[PDB]
RNA sequence: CCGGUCGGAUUUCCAACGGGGCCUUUCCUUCUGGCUAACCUUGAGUCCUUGUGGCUCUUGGCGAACCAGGACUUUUACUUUGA
């Protein structure tokens, strides 16, 4: 209930998370099988722009399709649990780099730990559950360039308010500028 | 015209171009839900379908292939996707 | 622009957008998985089985429902033909022009459209020994017209 | 152009076209170039004040004058509502 | 930067739709397709009305931009415009043409009838052409009274109009007539209407 | 067939700003068209621009102003050795003080004033003005 | 910029233009020896406010410069500088 949920890493500030997981979890019956046997690796907390904070939660790779089961119904929980934050539900990849001319031969890199292929799944998790329908980078003329993500327009009223905190995230992780934008 | 606006384009003209040469290509078909008067149970299939169809239950014709675009039957109902 | 002819058309399927599963499935992979076998023991290509797995059970791609091919699927079960594809139905149709030959002998124009319908065999039969897929000695002549496959 | 010194040492700095920015030359013979009038605020007309289009000698003969007239002048205000970028 | 005085009346478009000249011919250009607000399915096509009146102040707010008001020059050649640009000539000053044009009139400055404009307002630049292709040879901007059939080579700003009808080639003249006097303070109020009848511009012929 | 994609990802351009056009739409992109217009638009003879992408390789739409003559490409992409930049440039530039050749250089693709002063050489790939 | 003057200093700051360096999920791939400077280990000499202070003395961990054995590691084309 304490040790369980993490992977080696005591902090209070997300020992109290793993507190206010066995709170739901225990008056959820009907769910707290489901909800036991995931875990999280670790968190870290950022601001935005909208005079708060946020929070980024590290999962183990295979069990994200776990976690997308149950997304959307524990989200808020912890939203009404803890004020002026937003959860972020992340995998965590592994990047390895890149071979040079005069370098030492080892085994041959496949291309899930590509820089270019980290970072296009790493939007796509952080716009769970609605979906990527195009993309365009803009080339400026003072030498600057910044992208832009065509998003769906279903569920985006779960999410709408959050991507003033979207761009904070990611500016953080790579060092990139994304403005998102909803046509109809 | 000499100064117009390529990245985007009217919704109404797009609807004219051919399959490909829109700005990012994809498919006009679709995929339908059909049912037929006796074993009331759904099958979901393809529009210009190649492949005359029966219910699994009920072996009785579904849509003819031809041409294009199936032909449905006759004595049926269908529902987009 | 069509080898060995010379026309220019363009039609093909155009591959939808979305590298994800439509929001109108309701099924498993496992139970999707087995359908593809199901009909491999029917002795089907893979191209009857996708225009069967579309037209019939919605399946729109089994490239991006499962996370393989079709013949990544059926060459990990063991249901996978010897000869590849496509260069056996250019063999069967080689017959089909050889076997006309044996009724016909004035026809100086059917015999001018096989040798282009063999021509197409050495470019296939180059491909695949060099990605050693066939082995290195197969060759195709008439006696083996009426060998391998006949 | 100008030298070690400073001084501007061409003959005459010459027209820019306004449509194009191509140039326009001493035997451009069909280089139109046009004013427009500044309104009162009782609606009479100002008569010393313009608005200055310059007009290429080749978007004429082409026919695609009009269009670059209506593009250019909606920018500053003068019309509404007559011309659109997305075509 | 043109207030609502300058809008368009629902008196003044009354008289456009009584005049018909809200129809276009049975074939666009490919340059006239802005003008275009949608096609009958009889087969004609309609022209945009606020469209025609937005560039219909245009011209004025150049004719009214000039110096002296005999450097405009208005032309005719068929039968339905030529009484109307003289009346339109007649109360504005300009130097009306109608009839034939003689070939080479703005170029070989030995003839009689020689002229050196600031303007040039045809008509119909279809069957008219021989003062656009001389106006090209020696600066002159030019305003044509557009159809949906004519070849818009040379032309600036463009009034839409029916080039068929003889209320619809009278009116517009009459319109523009009416605008251009209110810009040199000639009038008094844009509120008012002009006292003149506006079948005074048409064409009869027993 | 489709042999040189930047060869005519040029020929795309100059083919309509001759007509006095504002912009083009260029397919397929590529590494290196993007790079060779990342060196015309630090001296100003292009707009901006941006990329599409459809999971293929990408279109692209450029945004023309009115100071191109012409750009190009040079198809074999000869050795440039160091002591002959100087003769490749006095034959394709129009005169001595404006315009660029650009190359591709084991320190990334530049023109040719910019590699005067790092002091390296490698191979060419085309002119602009 | 500053000259400050019985053209050369620049106290001193600015624009560019090329170069290092670290940190960001991330470059030589290491090993054994000496070996030299250097942090430190049992701990003071050394001399400065008195020191397990370093400097450096003593045992002892090391990275750190150099020789020597290695130890293994796809291969070219082109271009830069040298003999």
Redesign the pocket.
């Known amino acids: 209930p304490q040790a369980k949920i993490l992977s080696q890493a005591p902090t209070e500030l997300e020992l109290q998370v793993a507190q206010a997981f066995v709170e739901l979890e225990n008056s959820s019956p009907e769910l707290k099988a489901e909800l036991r046997p995931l875990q999280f690796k670790s968190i870290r907390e950022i601001d935005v722009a909208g005079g708060k904070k946020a929070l980024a939660i590290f999962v183990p790779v295979p069990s994200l399709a776990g976690f997308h089961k149950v997304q959307t119904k524990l989200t808020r929980e912890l939203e009404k649990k803890f004020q002026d934050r937003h959860v972020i539900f992340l995998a ?4 390895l ?9 080892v085994q041959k890199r496949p291309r899930s730990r590509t820089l270019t292929a ?1 970072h296009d799944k ?1 939007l796509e998790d952080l716009v769970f559950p609605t979906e990527i329908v195009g993309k365009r980078v803009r080339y400026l003329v003072g030498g600057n360039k910044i992208q832009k993500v065509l998003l769906d327009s279903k569920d985006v009223q779960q999410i709408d308010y959050k991507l003033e905190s979207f761009q904070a995230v990611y500016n953080k992780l790579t060092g990139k500028q994304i403005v998102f934008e909803i046509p109809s | 015209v000499l100064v117009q606006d390529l990245l985007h384009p009217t919704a109404a003209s797009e609807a004219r171009k051919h399959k490909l040469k829109t700005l990012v290509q994809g498919p006009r078909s679709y995929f339908l839900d059909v049912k037929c008067p006796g074993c009331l149970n759904i099958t979901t299939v393809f529009s210009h379908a190649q492949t005359a169809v029966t219910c699994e239950s009920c072996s009785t014709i579904l849509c003819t292939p031809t041409g294009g675009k199936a032909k449905l039957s006759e004595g049926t109902s269908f529902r987009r996707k | 622009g069509r080898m060995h002819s010379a026309g220019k058309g363009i039609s093909s399927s155009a591959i939808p957008y979305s590298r994800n599963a439509p929001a109108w499935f309701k099924l498993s992979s496992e139970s999707v998985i087995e359908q593809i076998v199901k009909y491999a023991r029917k002795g089907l290509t893979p191209s009857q089985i996708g225009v069967l797995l579309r037209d019939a059970h919605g399946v729109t791609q089994a490239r991006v429902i499962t996370g393989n091919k079709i013949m990544r699927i059926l060459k990990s079960n063991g249901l996978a033909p010897e000869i590849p594809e496509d260069l056996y139905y250019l063999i069967k149709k080689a017959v089909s022009v050889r076997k006309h030959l044996e009724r016909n002998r004035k026809d100086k124009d059917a015999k001018f459209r096989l040798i282009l319908i063999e021509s197409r065999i050495h470019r296939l039969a180059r491909y695949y020994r060099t990605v050693a897929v066939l082995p290195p000695n197969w060759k195709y002549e008439s006696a083996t017209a009426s060998a391998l496959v006949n | 152009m100008e030298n070690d010194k400073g001084q501007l040492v061409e003959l005459y700095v010459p027209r820019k076209c306004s449509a194009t920015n191509r140039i326009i030359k001493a035997d451009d013979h069909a280089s139109v170039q046009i004013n427009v009038a500044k309104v009162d605020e009782e609606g009479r007309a100002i008569p010393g004040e313009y608005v200055t289009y310059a007009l290429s000698g080749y978007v004429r003969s082409r026919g695609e004058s009009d269009d670059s007239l209506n593009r250019l002048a909606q920018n500053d205000g003068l019309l509404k509502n007559v011309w659109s970028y997305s075509r | 930067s043109l207030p609502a005085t300058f809008d368009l009346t629902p008196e003044d478009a009354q008289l456009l739709l009584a005049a018909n000249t809200h129809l276009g011919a049975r074939n666009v250009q490919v340059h006239q397709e802005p003008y275009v607000f949608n096609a009958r399915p009889d087969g004609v096509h309609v022209i945009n009305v606020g469209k025609t009146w937005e560039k219909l102040v245009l011209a004025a707010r150049i004719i009214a931009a000039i110096p002296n008001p005999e450097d405009v020059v208005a032309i005719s050649s068929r039968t339905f415009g030529q009484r109307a640009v003289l009346k339109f000539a007649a109360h504005t000053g300009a130097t009306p043409i109608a009839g034939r044009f003689t070939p080479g009139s703005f170029t070989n400055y030995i003839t009689r009838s020689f002229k050196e404009p600031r303007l040039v307002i045809v008509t119909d630049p279809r069957s008219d052409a021989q003062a656009i292709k001389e106006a090209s040879y020696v600066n002159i901007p030019v305003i044509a009274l557009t159809d949906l059939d004519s070849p818009s080579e040379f032309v600036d700003v463009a009034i839409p109009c029916n080039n068929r009808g003889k209320h619809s080639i009278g009116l517009i003249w009459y319109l523009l007539a009416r605008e251009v006097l209110r810009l040199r303070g000639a009038l008094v109020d844009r509120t008012q209407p002009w006292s003149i009848m506006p079948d005074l511009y048409f064409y009869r012929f027993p | 067939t489709r042999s040189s994609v930047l060869a005519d990802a040029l020929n795309a351009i100059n083919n309509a700003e001759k007509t006095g056009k504002r912009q083009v739409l260029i397919r397929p992109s590529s590494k290196v068209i993007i790079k060779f217009l990342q060196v015309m638009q630090k001296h100003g003879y292009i707009g901006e621009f941006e990329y599409i992408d459809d999971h293929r390789s990408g279109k692209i739409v450029v945004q023309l102003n009115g100071r191109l003559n012409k750009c190009g490409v040079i198809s074999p992409r000869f ?5 002959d930049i100087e003769k490749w440039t006095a034959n394709l530039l129009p005169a001595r003080q404006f315009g660029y050749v650009i190359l591709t ?3 990334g693709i530049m023109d040719h004033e ?1 590699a005067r ?7 060419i790939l085309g002119f602009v003005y």
Not at chain 1, 92 to 95: D, G, K, N, P, V
């Open positions: 965590e990849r592994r990047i780099p890149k071979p040079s001319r005069t370098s030492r031969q980290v790493i | 050795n440039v050795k160091i002591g250089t084991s320190a910019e002063r790092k002091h390296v050489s490698g191979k």
